[PDB]
Amino acid sequence: AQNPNCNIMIFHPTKEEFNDFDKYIAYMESQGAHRAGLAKIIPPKEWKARETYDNISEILIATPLQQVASGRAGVFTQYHKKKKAMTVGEYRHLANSKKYQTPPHQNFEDLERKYWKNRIYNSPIYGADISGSLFDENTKQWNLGHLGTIQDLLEKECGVVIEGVNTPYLYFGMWKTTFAWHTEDMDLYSINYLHLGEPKTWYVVPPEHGQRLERLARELFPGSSRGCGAFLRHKVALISPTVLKENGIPFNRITQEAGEFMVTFPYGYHAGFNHGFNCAEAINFATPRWIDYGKMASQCSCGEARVTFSMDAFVRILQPERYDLWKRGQD
Ligand SMILES: O=C(O)CNC(=O)C(=O)O
Numbered sequence: 001a002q003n004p005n006c007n008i009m010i011f012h013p014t015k016e017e018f019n020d021f022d023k024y025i026a027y028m029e030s031q032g033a034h035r036a037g038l039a040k041i042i043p044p045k046e047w048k049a050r051e052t053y054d055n056i057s058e059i060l061i062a063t064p065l066q067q068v069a070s071g072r073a074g075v076f077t078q079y080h081k082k083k084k085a086m087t088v089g090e091y092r093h094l095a096n097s098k099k100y101q102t103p104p105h106q107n108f109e110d111l112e113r114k115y116w117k118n119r120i121y122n123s124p125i126y127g128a129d130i131s132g133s134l135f136d137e138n139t140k141q142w143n144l145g146h147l148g149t150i151q152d153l154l155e156k157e158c159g160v161v162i163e164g165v166n167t168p169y170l171y172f173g174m175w176k177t178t179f180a181w182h183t184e185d186m187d188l189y190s191i192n193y194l195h196l197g198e199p200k201t202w203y204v205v206p207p208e209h210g211q212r213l214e215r216l217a218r219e220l221f222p223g224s225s226r227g228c229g230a231f232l233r234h235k236v237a238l239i240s241p242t243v244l245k246e247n248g249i250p251f252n253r254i255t256q257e258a259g260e261f262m263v264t265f266p267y268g269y270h271a272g273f274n275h276g277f278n279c280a281e282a283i284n285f286a287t288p289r290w291i292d293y294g295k296m297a298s299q300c301s302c303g304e305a306r307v308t309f310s311m312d313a314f315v316r317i318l319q320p321e322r323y324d325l326w327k328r329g330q331d
């Protein structure tokens, strides 16, 4: 068995290996990458997502989210308070302000320490989940706006034609902006490209150990657990590496820098934070190996998790027994 310790693997494809996306994902899995739940892909040196980032300031962040924490430093939830619209240029200035900028630090490890010590005492503002793309239409390799769609994958594997579309999303982050512990909708893959700016630190639990994280989460967030049998779908809970280590949960960590891709694998729980002003782009995708994960994915039916139009068909076709109850949650 490849990668039996479930370490995060890092890949350096050549320009030739960068041509066929599906084939490279399957190669990485042949080497055991999926066992970690997360992989890094460093693009060939010849490749670029676009020519420059000089003209992005007029993109609108229609609903910036202020991420307000409750709990203790290592075990907290966050809620998203909606703020007034602002442009990317306005947001970048805000991120760079004395109130919100990254503190002086020695290295990524020191910054990670400061994040876990201090996150809860501040409420950073995140421009998340903005439909759109920063890939140039002429970029033919690993262009997250030109991937094969999940609907087309399900149709190719299962023969059923379904409605729905699959488009990317932009994320504009600042120091301390936080992504809570989650897997993807329907336990899909995700791919994330850090277009610009400061790094993003990731934490991940191997898929084969996801239920260990879930059991710890039900202990640590006991009212949320009683409210919903899949409350990590709410995407609000944080647990620090110190706490994970104290409770024996297997995980790994890695920092993504500008110009790098990360891939999350089916049922790989992940969480993380931004080091400073940055812009990422991400999208879900599927492969044949995903289908069985999609069929087994938990679902939130309490009404909190509220997701896209396109998840309907996935539930309806892969999880017909759950469909009724899940749809009640969506309506
Ligand atoms: O970058 C972020 O804030 C969150 N991204 C992801 O969870 C992802 O790409 O799967």
Ligand SMILES: [Mg+2]
Residues within 6 Å of the ligand: 055, 056, 057, 058, 059
């Ligand atoms: Mg612009």
Ligand code: NI
Residues within 6 Å of the ligand: 182, 183, 184, 190, 264, 270
């Ligand atoms: Ni994710």
Ligand SMILES: [Zn+2]
Residues within 6 Å of the ligand: 227, 228, 229, 230, 231, 233, 234, 300, 301, 302, 303, 304, 305
């Ligand atoms: Zn729920």
